[PDB]
Structure formats: C-alpha cells, structure tokens
Amino acid sequence: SPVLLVDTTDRVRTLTLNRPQSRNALSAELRSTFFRALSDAQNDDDVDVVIVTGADPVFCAGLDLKELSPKWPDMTKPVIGAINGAAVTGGLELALYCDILIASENAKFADTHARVGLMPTWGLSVRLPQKVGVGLARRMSLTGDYLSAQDALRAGLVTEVVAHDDLLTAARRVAASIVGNNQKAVRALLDSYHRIDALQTGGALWAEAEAARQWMRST
Amino acid sequence: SPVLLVDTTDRVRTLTLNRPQSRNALSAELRSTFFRALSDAQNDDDVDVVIVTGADPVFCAGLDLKELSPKWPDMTKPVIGAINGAAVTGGLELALYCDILIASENAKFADTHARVGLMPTWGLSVRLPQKVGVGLARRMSLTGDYLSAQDALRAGLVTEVVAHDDLLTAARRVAASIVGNNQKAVRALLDSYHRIDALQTGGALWAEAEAARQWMRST
Amino acid sequence: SPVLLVDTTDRVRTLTLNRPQSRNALSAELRSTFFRALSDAQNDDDVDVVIVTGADPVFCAGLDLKELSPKWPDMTKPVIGAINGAAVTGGLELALYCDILIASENAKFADTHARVGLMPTWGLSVRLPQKVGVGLARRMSLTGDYLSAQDALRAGLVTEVVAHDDLLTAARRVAASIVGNNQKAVRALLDSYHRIDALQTGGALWAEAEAARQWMRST
Amino acid sequence: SPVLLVDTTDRVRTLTLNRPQSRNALSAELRSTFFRALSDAQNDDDVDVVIVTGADPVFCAGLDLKELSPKWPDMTKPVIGAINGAAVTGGLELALYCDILIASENAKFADTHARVGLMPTWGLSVRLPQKVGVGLARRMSLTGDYLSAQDALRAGLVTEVVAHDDLLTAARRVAASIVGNNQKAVRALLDSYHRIDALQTGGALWAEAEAARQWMRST
Amino acid sequence: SPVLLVDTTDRVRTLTLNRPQSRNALSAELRSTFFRALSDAQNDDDVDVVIVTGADPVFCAGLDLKELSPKWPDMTKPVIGAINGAAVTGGLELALYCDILIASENAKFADTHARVGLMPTWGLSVRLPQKVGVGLARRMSLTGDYLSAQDALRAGLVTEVVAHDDLLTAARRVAASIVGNNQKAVRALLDSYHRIDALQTGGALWAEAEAARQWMRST
Amino acid sequence: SPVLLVDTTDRVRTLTLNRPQSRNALSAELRSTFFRALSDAQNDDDVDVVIVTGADPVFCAGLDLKELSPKWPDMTKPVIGAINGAAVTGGLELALYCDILIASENAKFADTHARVGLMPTWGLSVRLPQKVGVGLARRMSLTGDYLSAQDALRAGLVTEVVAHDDLLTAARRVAASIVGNNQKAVRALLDSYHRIDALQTGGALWAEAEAARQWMRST
Ligand SMILES: [Zn+2]
Ligand SMILES: [Zn+2]
Ligand SMILES: [Zn+2]
Ligand SMILES: [Zn+2]
Ligand SMILES: [Zn+2]
Ligand SMILES: [Zn+2]
C-alpha cells in the first residue's frame, strides 16, 4: 500500500501516515511524499483544511533510524494534527508543526533525542517549550518519558482529548467549523500568525541548528 | 444613561461599559469615553486600581459594526478585567489588554475576525497566543467558536472563575489586596512588566498592523 | 550545622538550604555557599544531576533582609527544584532558575517585592510571566498573595505535585530517569535550551535591571 | 501634465515625481499614483528594475502640508533612487525606502519633522540611523540642517555622487548591470534582504508609530 | 576648583569635566557630580541642550584607577559631546553615550580595557561597533591603539572635525540650530530615538554585563 | 604543494589559501583543511592571533563550482583577514567572517551569487549590509560589480588599505599590537563581541538559510 493515504471530503484533505508496520517511521520516501502532499494541499483550490494523522496504533515514532534541514512548507491553510497514538522525537516535531492538535485518549508524546544521542533539527527545542512550557519541555527532553494525553491537555500542547474512536470525528468537527468561515480571511489571519511566529522563533531555530552542527562535529 | 458608568470606592475605580441594548458594542462614543476614562484614572491621585466590566449579560461584543489604530493608554496602575459574559472580537482584544482577568461562570471568549472578514488591529493576533497558547489561539481564530470560562481558566487566559453573582465581589478582593501594598512599588513593578512586554511584542504588533493594511488594500 | 547540606547518591547531588531557624533566608554566607556548590556540581565528574531543596518546613523565604546582581552560574547539568514549602520573593526567583520543578502539596509561591518596597534583580519579572503566565504573574506580584501547589501545577510553574513525604522520592525518580540517558547528549541539549532561553530573555533581563536601578536612585 | 511621469526602456521603469511647481510635494493624488505605480511595476513582466527620481530641481520636499500609515508596497524588483535635488522630511523617507541611492552633486537631505512639529510615520526614525549612522541621524533630525551629497556619500546614505547632468546616466548604468543578471535570483536575493530587514526593523517601526500616536494625542 | 564646571548661555548648558591634573579621570566624586548635573539639566526648564567637554588637553582618560553599573540618566534633551582630546576607555564610553559628537583635530579615541585587564560595563562593547563599525571596533579593542579624529570622522563616530580653537564654537553652532527648533518636538523625537535604541541594544547590554560578571568571578 | 600553507611566528599563525592555479577556490579539500586549521589555531597554546590570506594574485574566488551549512568555528582568538586580491562570493563570505580586515590596494570585493543563480548560505546577506551598509550591499549583490579597496575603506568593510607589498607587513603590525596585550582579556572581550553579534544576527541567519532552502526547492 502507499506510504501516505490521501482523502478529500467536504474541502478537508486528510493525510494519513501509512507505515504502521514500522510505527509510521519517517523514511526518506514517507518524508518526501508527506512534505509534497502538504505543498500540493496548499496549491489545490479544492482544499481548505488539512488533517494529519497516523495509521493506528502509533502516530509517528520519528525518523526511520534503521534506514538512516527542515522541510515543512509555508502554508496558509490550517493543519490539524489528530494524534492517534505515540508521537515520538521526529514525530513529536511533526505534531509541533501543526496549527491545532486534538488527541486520542491513547495519544502520548516523548522526546528521545538525548537517549539516542541525537540533537533536534526540526524545531523540538524551540517549539516544545513554546507549546508545553519550559519546565515540562526540559523534563520531557532530559527524561525521555512519555507525556500522557491528559497531561498534554493540562499543559496546552493539545486543545482537546477525545475517546479513541471519536478522534477523526472530532478533527472533522473542527475542520468543518473552519470551512464555514471566510476562507480569504482564514488564510490571511493564519499567514499573519505564521509570520509573527517566524519573527519570534527564528533566532532560536538558528541556535538549535548551530547546536546540532556542533554536536555532529564533536561526535 | 451614560455609555460608561464610573464608580470610585476604596481607591478602586470601576468602569462599566454601558450599552447593553447593543451588547456593549464599542461605538465611537464609547471608545472615546472609555479610553479617556483610563487616562483619567491614571492621572487621578484618588485611584490606585481600575476594574473594567460590562453591563450584563454581555462583556463586550466588539466594535459597533452597524455604526462602522490602538488607543489603550500607557498606565502604571493595575487594570483588572471582570468578564461578566461574552467577550468577542474587539471585546476579546479589550480583555487581552487587561493586566489580570477574573471571569464569571458565564464568561465566554471568541474571535470572529475571520468570520466577518476583518483583520485584527488591537493586538488579538499577538496577545491571544501569548495568553491562551498558540494552538488554542489558532483554533479560536480559525473556528470562531466560543471558549468557555472553565477552558479559559485551564488555558491561562483568566486567573479565576467565580459564580456570576460573585464576579465583582471577587474583583474587589483582588483590588483590595493590591490597594494594601506599597503603591509606589506596585506602579514601578507594573511599569516594568509593561516595558518588558512592549519590548517582546512590538515586532509582532507591527506585523499584525502590516497584515491588516495589506488586507484592507487587497480587499 | 552547615548552612548548606550536600549529599551525592547515584550520581545525583542534593543541595539542601539549611537555615530553617531563619526560613532558609539567603544570607550572604548561604548565597556564597549555594552558588559555589552549583559551580562545584557542574565541575564534578561524579555528578550528573542536581536537586535543590530546603530544610522543612519552608523552601526559601527570600533574601535575609535582617542582615541586609545575579549569581546563578552557567550549568549544563540539570537542576531539579524540589519545593517543600513556601518559596517567597528571592526564594521564588531561586525556584524560577531551576530547569524542572516538583512540588509538595505544601509548597506555595509568592512575590512580596512590592510589599517590601523592592524591585526584583534575579529575574522574577522575566521568568514569572514566562513560567506561570502573564496575568497570573501580574496578579501574584501586585497582590503578594500565595499561589498554591495545585494552582502552580495548573499554571505550568511545576511539573508535578506529590504528598509531602514523597517529595524527595519523586525528585529522585526524575533524576534517575535523566541519569539513565546519554549524559553527553543530556548536557548538549540542556546547554542548547539554556542558550535559546538566554537569547529570548536577555533584553528583558536588562530592562528588569534598569528598572531596579531607577528605583534605587529615585527611592 | 500628469503628476507622475512613467517611462520603460531596456526593462527599466523610471517613475518621475512631476509636481515641480510644488517642489514635488506628495499630495494625496501623487501619493496614490506613485504607490500604485510601484505595485504596477512589480506586477509587470516587462519590468526588471525601477528608478525613482524627481522633476528638477527638487527631488521631493515632503508631504503637501498646504493640502493637509506607510504605503510603500512589498517589492522584489530593485528600486534605485536617483536623487536630483533636495529630499526633505517625507521626501527623505521616500529616499530611505529605496534599495540603492545615487545622488547628483546637487542632492541634499534634511529632516524638518521637529521644525514643523510633526513626528515621522514613514520610517525616518528607524531608517535614517540605519543608513547615515546614529549620531548623524540625530544631528539631522534635531537641527533640521541640510546634509550635502558629499557628506551623504561619506556617511553611506548614497552609493555614488555624480555631476547633475550625469545622474540618470548613472542610474541607468546600475540598472543595466542588474538587468544583465539572473532575474529569478535577483528577486529571490532582494526578497531575502527585505525579509531580513523587516525582521530587524519591525519593533522599531512599531515604536516610531506609537511615538507618533502619543504626539498626536498630546498635541 | 570644582571637579565639574557648569555654564548656561542661550539655553545651552555646558558641563566641563575639570580634573585636568588627572586627565579628567572619573573619580567617584566626578562621576556623582557629572551624572547629577545631567539629571539637573534634564529637569531645568532654562536648558534645552547640553554640551559635554573636558578641560584641555584630554577629554577623559577613563575611570580613576588609582582611586579604584551604568549611571547615565534617561534624557530627552540633546547631549553634544565636544571631544577636545583623548577619550580613553571609560572616557570613550562617555563619548559613546552622547547623541552627537564633534571633535577637535586633537581628539583621539582608544579602548584600553583589554590592556588593563578589565571588561567594559558602560556599553563600550555594544556602542563602539554601533558607532564606528564592527571591524574597527574589534581592531580598537584588541590593539588598544588610538583612532585619530579624521579616522573617527571617516568611520562615523563623529559628525564633524574642526580646528582645536573652534571646537566649542562649533558645538555652540549645532546647539543653536537645535535651540531654534520646536523644543516639544525635539524632545519627543529624541525620546523616540532613545526608545528605539534601547529596544535594539538591551539584549546586547545584558550580554556585556554578564561577560563582565563572569570575568570578575574567574579573575 | 599543500592546499593551505601554515606559518607560526611571534605567536601569530598565518593561514595562506594555496590553490592559486584555481584562484584559491574553496574545494572540499581546502574547506576541510582551512576550517580544521582555524580550530587547531584556537586550541594551540602557542598561538594568540590568526592571519588569513591568499596566495597571489586572488584572495579567494569562492566555492569550487567545477568540483560542485556554515563551517567557520567558534573562536576567541582574533582573526585578521589580509585581503591580497579579489574576494568573490564565498570568498567575500570568508572575508566577512574575519574580525578585522586589512586590504591591499589590489583588493576588490564582489558578490556574484545572483549571477550564478545561487543563494548565499555563509552569511553574505546578513554580514554584507552589516559591514558595508544596506544600500551598498544591495548594489553589490544585485549588480555583481566589484567594490574597490578604496571604496571598501570608505564604506567600513576594511580598516586599512596599504600598498600590495606592505599587506602582510601591515597585518603583522596589527597582530603584534594584539599580542602585546593581556591575552586572557583579549579573548574574553572578543568572545563577548562574538556573543553579542550572534544574538543580533541569528534570526537573520535563519532567514538567509530558509531563503536558500526555498530557492533550492523551487529551482
Ligand atoms: Zn528530530
Ligand atoms: Zn479587532
Ligand atoms: Zn528578588
Ligand atoms: Zn514623515
Ligand atoms: Zn569601561
Ligand atoms: Zn556563498
């Protein structure tokens, strides 16, 4: 089957990471396909909103390390992450790129970069404190322990936690609310939020990149 | 009756938005009167603390669109928003300007800018992510849906949620605690918090203003 | 007895503020000793993680005012604050320096700078809004009221609240999880988080310092 | 005659401010026409480079005060200012918007905002120190005195000073060099320079706007 | 004689550093007196403009090291430095605080911090690259060599170089031009320039302060 | 012969780019060797100061395009660029990394990125406006024309221009002045200048990197 499933219904495009046999690990092929699908959704006049999710039971375990710069494209259409299970390391970075997250009761979040001896290059060290808080981000990154869905909700990492079998139902509800609004305005306002975020995070992203380069050279 | 009610008791000045027949919409007259009242409170040696609230049952529905730059003045005296009902769009921006918010169980918060085809110019796109979190701000702005008082408390937008008939009781308790402190120090510390906030948000506020101008020109 | 107790067990160094007769107030001697102990822990190859706590029942009441620039050193080893009781003013600033906080059910947090007519110089006005939110930080600083452990957890100031007699048990669990990871990577990632934080907070820290100097001169 | 002359030769569009009877003062009509012409040049596939100049003997004396937000559009095509005479106040702000300036021996530059009791809103207080240096910008703004073409060259405000009758010859030489390069790359690189500049100047531009608003309200 | 001479003529207050027997070194007394005189000038309605100069033949050799935080106050009135001779180390920092510099042909500028084993705490490491350029600032600081008046003019550190016996004549000319303008506007515009500068330099000033503290502790 | 010549005399290490047959183009081998030599100089207690120069008659023509992230290491020892001839594109970026530049009368500087259809990734778009001014940087990048040594001196890109046969004589004079100072202080002060620069430029460097990635993907 394809590594990425694509559905478009009611102006909402759902992109489902589809390597469950490998915990939806981001192989070179899946990365290429996923990032291209985001760009294609942005360019497709039939699409107002994107949902990103994973084939059960894991959302995304991270980069395919067996097999082994940022790639997530500039978008003005909203991206909703429907986190169905574990979102780990590069998969947590994928979740952190989304505009809005909704979680299954089964979702959990972890950063194992330190454990596997890697430094983050897709924004974890910038966006995790931004979205879960400074102390909790540090606790996650230094322990490698899982953060539960309920704790993710308490911390602000996700907007909503629902029963597992209601996850895509819930994501479709949020998408439908967006679809009902003025799309020119939705896109203008989201572009602006993105520009403000880029202004506030770029120095940090450079610092993250520099720390990764220094790690690779020393290691 | 006047569009703005003013009371001063125990060194606390309460400013009550008073156009309930129009959901306390910010007409030109109410904007002028309100912003002047803030400045007058700052200049009045009989006042230590301001409470802003609305005539029931709505806090503020936003700019008077039927009738139709930032105006909130530099202040060193604390402003407590006692949110008694819906705070929508420009009214949510008014709430976001306050130093400290307390909510009735009946309070709710929404951003309808996208729905009505307007871009924010009173800081919503900067202060909403700052005070409710990135994902929740994006969810609010893109859906236009209401955020409940309890969810506002969970997210950090408000400090306290109380029964409706205890709202101004609660706001007076917080004000009285402030009044009991060293007012020179209260003002020096709040001025400093404001200066730090201005330093951290100005680039973003410029970006918001630029996005609004680009919207007006394109639209 | 010494003003600072030191234990090293399982590569974790616990530094216990030990002036309970004075609410663990930071005398000149305790400040010197504590800040030196942090540096010594950083330099000691037998130590991976630091826990900071207080002799019961107070964590730290602040600077010793009876007796009466920032001193907390650059560190790449994680510092866990185990807050056992009240953390007030300079003691709240000590808590705010920690990477990760865990609280006893008995912990409480307050800022009395305004009440005692002092401006903060150890980062309270920068780190309190960063870690508890803008409105709650302003409410704390202007009222001087205590924030409970449960409210600190809701707000994101602490990562976990436990029964009092489980506090150091809990802190040791988090420390042990860190100790089990790749220490080169733990330190590289924490150094990076610190560098990103320094980049984002330095302007604010300057503003805080300038406001303190202006207060001292005017007062 | 039209208030703005337009020529397109060798893929270079020259926009000549054409109200010499009024020192090329920026009336409402000329502002509208000029800013629209910039946008039209950006959108016109027949144009690679813009030259802005004035009908002799003045470049631009500023806003038409007799008759009486920023409007200069986002552009990726280079704009060369050929300063033929005095560039004063709003006219100095027009010069400061250009990517590259070349001056006649007759060019001179002045800021009279203070003298006429106005605050700048088109970036003078940000871009003048950026392009002529801090001390010289302050000297200009506080004295209102003219800066000569030679002193403008020494300071870095202009790239080249030529005999008056060679001014547009010189501007065409620079334009032709640009036209000979890879235009996709020229535009990508200039867009990037503009984005970097926007990141570095936005906070300052907000501060300038806030100071102007405070002036208007106080005055 | 007094350590600081004061004259007020034509609404211009000249403050002359007056310890020529000690190369106008900034003793505790002279620092106190000078910084107070700046504040007094700001508060004195008889004064529009300040000139700072030194008793010949040295402007200021720096802190009085024999005898041995920033103190220069917030001002909205312009300060013109008339540099009559050598401006070294702390004296170069005094020059760097001025809004506008004019130099005698005899002026020269040097940074000897490294040579004497001190780190700067009055902004040299921020303002020297800002006002003379990155490479030249680094060359000055690392060599300790003098920068001539002509080279200071070329680099942008000073606005004008005049014969020695014309120095205060020249400074009075610039002051008189300022005095002829709208003083409300002069002050509003200079306050704004100062606020923009503070926004852009505060992070750097914190970094300078932190580097000095780290030097003192290591040394 | 080796691609990089190394000499150490009087505590000064001269690194001479040595592929004159290829205009000192930065092949993979020369990049590796050069960047390693910088790190080795930093680590070598026999070295206080580095001079970088090229085998005549070209300084560095840029990346070896025939053959075809930033690599310049963190250093606290000063690096003096002695620019002996043309410094083009990547070679101009090498020059821009140096702390202090001195030029031969034969030096010239150019940016051909646009001409060859490449975006800069070694800081040209950040450091060129920083060191030569905004307008001149834009003129250089968009024209591809050479900047002369004298114009480089006028603009602030270099500190000194000397006869060609005096170039390394001059560089040794500056190095010797540095060597005569307190080396602990030289390094502490330069580290601080570098940290301040990193704070001020990181956001811009991220933006440059993002623009390059977007170019590679579109192209
Ligand atoms: Zn990663
Ligand atoms: Zn609005
Ligand atoms: Zn304190
Ligand atoms: Zn203007
Ligand atoms: Zn100094
Ligand atoms: Zn390059």
DSSP state string for A102-113: EEETT-EEE--T
Contact between residue E56 and residue E20 where contact means Cβ atoms under 8 Å apart? yes
**Gaps in chain A after residue (C–N beyond 2.5 Å):** 68
Spatial neighbors of F66 by CB under 8 A, at least 6 apart, are F22, F25
Contact between residue F130 and residue F157 where contact means Cβ atoms under 8 Å apart? no
Half-sphere exposure of B114 (CA within 13 A, CB side): 29
Chains that touch E (3 or more CB pairs under 8 A): B, C, D, F
Residue type, D162: V
Q: Do C211 and B191 touch (CB under 8 A)?
A: yes
Using DSSP's 3-state secondary structure scheme, residue A158 falls into coil
- CA-wise closest residue to D157 among D137, D183, D184: D137
Residues of F with CB under 8 A from a CB of D: 113-120, 125-126, 129, 133-139, 141-145, 154-156, 203-204, 207-208, 211, 214-215, 219
What the block records as the tokens of F50 is 């580095």
- CA-wise closest residue to F155 among E136, D122, E16: E136
Burial of F219 (0-12, 13-18, 19+ CB in 10 A): exposed
> With the C-alpha atoms ordered B163, B168, B172, B174, is the resulting torsion angle positive or negative?
positive
Q: To one decimal place, what's the resolution in Å?
A: 1.6
Q: Which residue has the tokens 């940074």?
A: E111
**CA atoms of F82 and F14, how far apart (whole Å):** 10
Residue numbers in D near B199 (CB within 8 A): 203
What the block records as the tokens of A110 is 């972890």
- CA-wise closest residue to B189 among C137, C211, E198: C211
Q: Do A202 and D199 touch (CB under 8 A)?
A: yes
Q: What experimental approach yielded this model?
A: X-ray
Looking at CA atoms only, how far is residue E48 from chain D in angstroms?
A: 11
- CA-wise closest residue to D15 among D42, D38, D31: D38
Tell me the pairing of strands F147-148 and F108-110.
antiparallel
CA of D63 to the centre of ligand 4 (A): 7
Q: Residue B4 carries which DSSP code?
A: E
**CA atoms of B134 and C31, how far apart (whole Å):** 38
Looking at CA atoms only, how far is residue C173 from chain E in angstroms?
A: 34
CA of A94 to the centre of ligand 1 (A): 9
Spatial neighbors of D57 by CB under 8 A, at least 6 apart, are D20, D84, D85, D106
CA of B183 to the centre of ligand 1 (A): 49
Chains D & E: contacts with CB separation below 8 Å:
97
CA of C121 to the centre of ligand 3 (A): 5
Spatial neighbors of E32 by CB under 8 A, at least 6 apart, are none
| CA trace torsion A199, A200, A205, A210 (10° rounding) | 90
Distances (CA, A) of A115 to A128, A145, A159, C93, C159: 17, 10, 28, 31, 21
Q: How many CB atoms within 10 Å of residue F9?
A: 9
Chains that touch B (3 or more CB pairs under 8 A): A, C, D, E
Bridge partners for F63 per DSSP? F26
Burial of D43 (0-12, 13-18, 19+ CB in 10 A): exposed
- CA-wise closest residue to A104 among A79, A129, A122, A84: A84
Contact between residue D36 and residue D75 where contact means Cβ atoms under 8 Å apart? no
**CA atoms of C27 and C19, how far apart (whole Å):** 9
**CA atoms of C189 and C177, how far apart (whole Å):** 15
Q: Which chain residues have CB less than 5 Å from ligand 5, an ion?
A: E 90, 120, 122
Q: Residue C2 carries which DSSP code?
A: -
Looking at CA atoms only, how far is residue F199 from chain C in angstroms?
A: 6
Residue numbers in B near E199 (CB within 8 A): 199, 202
What sections of F1-148 are H helices per DSSP?
28-43, 90-97, 124-132, 134-143
**CA atoms of D21 and B72, how far apart (whole Å):** 42
> With the C-alpha atoms ordered E186, E187, E190, E192, is the resulting torsion angle positive or negative?
negative
Bridge partners for E60 per DSSP? E87
**CA atoms of B200 and C3, how far apart (whole Å):** 39
What the block records as the tokens of C77 is 């080893």
Contact between residue E135 and residue F100 where contact means Cβ atoms under 8 Å apart? yes
Q: List b or e across F156-175, with b for residues whose CB sees 16 or more CB atoms inside 10 angstroms.
A: bbbbbbbebeebbebbbbbb
Nearest CA in chain E to F159: E136
Residue numbers in C near F201 (CB within 8 A): none
| CA trace torsion E83, E88, E91, E97 (10° rounding) | 70
Looking at CA atoms only, how far is residue E212 from chain B in angstroms?
A: 23
Q: What is the DSSP string of B79-103?
A: EEEEE-SEEETHHHHHHHHSSEEEE
Bridge partners for F163 per DSSP? none
CA of B134 to the centre of ligand 2 (A): 18
- CA-wise closest residue to E110 among E137, E145, E136: E145
- Residue B205 phi/psi, 5-degree rounding, is -60, -40
CA of E119 to the centre of ligand 5 (A): 7
**CA atoms of F178 and B69, how far apart (whole Å):** 53
The angle that helices C124-132 and C134-143 make with each other, rounded to 10 degrees, is 130
Looking at CA atoms only, how far is residue D129 from chain E in angstroms?
A: 9
Half-sphere exposure of B8 (CA within 13 A, CB side): 12
Q: Which of D157, D191, D196 faces F204 most closely, judged by CB atoms? A: D196
Bridge partners for E209 per DSSP? none
Looking at CA atoms only, how far is residue E119 from chain B in angstroms?
A: 27
What the block records as the tokens of C132 is 């508890």
Chains A & C: contacts with CB separation below 8 Å:
97
What the block records as the tokens of D24 is 């090329």
Q: Which residues of B carry a binding-site annotation? A: 93, 113
Mutate to test the interface with D, among F125, F138, F146, F154 (most CBs of D within 10 A): F138
Mutate to test the interface with B, among D31, D206, D215, D218 (most CBs of B within 10 A): D206
Residue type, B164: H
Residue type, F206: W
Residues found in chain A = 219
Contact between residue D84 and residue D57 where contact means Cβ atoms under 8 Å apart? yes
**CA atoms of F24 and D183, how far apart (whole Å):** 28
Q: Which residue has the tokens 């005999």?
A: D163
Topology annotation, domain E1-219:
2-enoyl-CoA Hydratase; Chain A, domain 1 (3.90.226)
Q: What is the DSSP string of D174-208?
A: HHHHHHTS-HHHHHHHHHHHHHHHHHHHHHHHHHH
CA of E193 to the centre of ligand 5 (A): 24
Ligand nearest to the CA of A114: 1
Contact between residue A211 and residue C195 where contact means Cβ atoms under 8 Å apart? yes
Contact between residue C92 and residue C54 where contact means Cβ atoms under 8 Å apart? no
What sections of chain A are H helices per DSSP?
28-43, 90-97, 124-132, 134-143, 149-155, 167-179, 183-218
Using DSSP's 3-state secondary structure scheme, residue D37 falls into helix
Q: How many CB atoms within 10 Å of residue B217?
A: 11
Spatial neighbors of D131 by CB under 8 A, at least 6 apart, are D96, D156, D157, F133, F134, F135
Residues of C with CB under 8 A from a CB of A: 78, 98-101, 130-131, 153-154, 156-159, 174, 177-178, 181-182, 184-186, 188-193, 195-197, 199-200
Find the farthest-apart pair of alpha carbons in chain E and give their distance in angstroms, rounded.
52
**CA atoms of F7 and E132, how far apart (whole Å):** 32
Tell me the pairing of strands C4-9 and E79-83.
unpaired
Q: Do A69 and F207 touch (CB under 8 A)?
A: no
Residue numbers in C near A118 (CB within 8 A): 185
**CA atoms of D121 and D205, how far apart (whole Å):** 8
**CA atoms of C42 and C53, how far apart (whole Å):** 17
Residue numbers in A near B126 (CB within 8 A): 196
Residue numbers in C near A152 (CB within 8 A): none
What the block records as the tokens of D53 is 């100049």
Residue numbers in D near A202 (CB within 8 A): 199
**CA atoms of B61 and B59, how far apart (whole Å):** 7
Contact between residue A86 and residue B122 where contact means Cβ atoms under 8 Å apart? no
Bridge partners for E108 per DSSP? E86, E148
Looking at CA atoms only, how far is residue D94 from chain F in angstroms?
A: 14
Nearest CA in chain B to D35: B217
Residue numbers in A near B93 (CB within 8 A): none
Nearest CA in chain D to F136: D159
Q: Residue B63 carries which DSSP code?
A: B
Q: What is the DSSP string of chain E?
A: --SEEEEEETTEEEEEE--GGGTT-B-HHHHHHHHHHHHHHHH-TT-SEEEEEESTT-SB--B-TTT----PPP-SS-EEEEE-SEEETHHHHHHHHSSEEEEETT-EEE--TTTTT----SSHHHHHHHHH-HHHHHHHHHH-PPEEHHHHHHHTS-S-EE-GGGHHHHHHHHHHHHHTS-HHHHHHHHHHHHHHHHHHHHHHHHHHHHHHHHHHHH-
Spatial neighbors of F181 by CB under 8 A, at least 6 apart, are E114, E115, E142, E143, E144
Residue numbers in C near B130 (CB within 8 A): 134
Using DSSP's 3-state secondary structure scheme, residue D130 falls into helix
What sections of B17-56 are H helices per DSSP?
28-43
Looking at CA atoms only, how far is residue D202 from chain A in angstroms?
A: 9
**CA atoms of B145 and B133, how far apart (whole Å):** 16
- CA-wise closest residue to E188 among D63, D116, D157, D91: D116
Residue type, A119: M
Chains that touch D (3 or more CB pairs under 8 A): A, B, E, F
What the block records as the tokens of B134 is 């990135």
DSSP E strand stretches across chain D: 4-9, 12-17, 49-54, 79-83, 86-88, 100-104, 108-110, 147-148, 161-162
Q: Which chain residues have CB less than 5 Å from ligand 1, an ion?
A: A 90, 120, 122
**CA atoms of B160 and B150, how far apart (whole Å):** 9
- CA-wise closest residue to E128 among E161, E87, E168, E70: E87
Q: How many CB atoms within 10 Å of residue D45?
A: 6
Q: What end-to-end distance do the CA atoms of chain D give, in Å? A: 38
CA of F100 to the centre of ligand 5 (A): 22
Contact between residue D18 and residue D53 where contact means Cβ atoms under 8 Å apart? no
Residue numbers in E near C203 (CB within 8 A): 199, 202-203, 206
Q: Do C195 and A203 touch (CB under 8 A)?
A: no
Q: Do F202 and C202 touch (CB under 8 A)?
A: no
Q: How many CB atoms within 10 Å of residue C182?
A: 16
H or E element in which residue D92 lies: helix D90-97
Burial of D68 (0-12, 13-18, 19+ CB in 10 A): exposed
Contact between residue D47 and residue D33 where contact means Cβ atoms under 8 Å apart? no
